[PDB]
Amino acid sequence: LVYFAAXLKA
Amino acid sequence: LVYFAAXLKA
Amino acid sequence: LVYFAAXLKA
Amino acid sequence: LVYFAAXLKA
Ligand SMILES: [Cl-]
Ligand SMILES: [Cl-]
Ligand SMILES: [Cl-]
Ligand SMILES: [Cl-]
Numbered sequence: 001l002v003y004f005a006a007x008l009k010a
Numbered sequence: 011l012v013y014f015a016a017x018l019k020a
Numbered sequence: 021l022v023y024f025a026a027x028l029k030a
Numbered sequence: 031l032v033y034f035a036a037x038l039k040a
Pocket of ligand 2: 016017
């Protein structure tokens with residue numbers, strides 16, 4: 001999973 | 011939360 | 021992407 | 031966020 005919430009888990 | 015893994019909830 | 025966070029983007 | 035797209039962040 002690529003995510004941003006202020007920065008990979010994919 | 012913005013998230014992509016292939017598509018906001020933040 | 022299949023996701024649930026409360027419901028396809030894949 | 032729960033997500034599968036082939037595997038929690040919620
Ligand atoms: Cl996909
Ligand atoms: Cl794609
Ligand atoms: Cl949908
Ligand atoms: Cl779709």
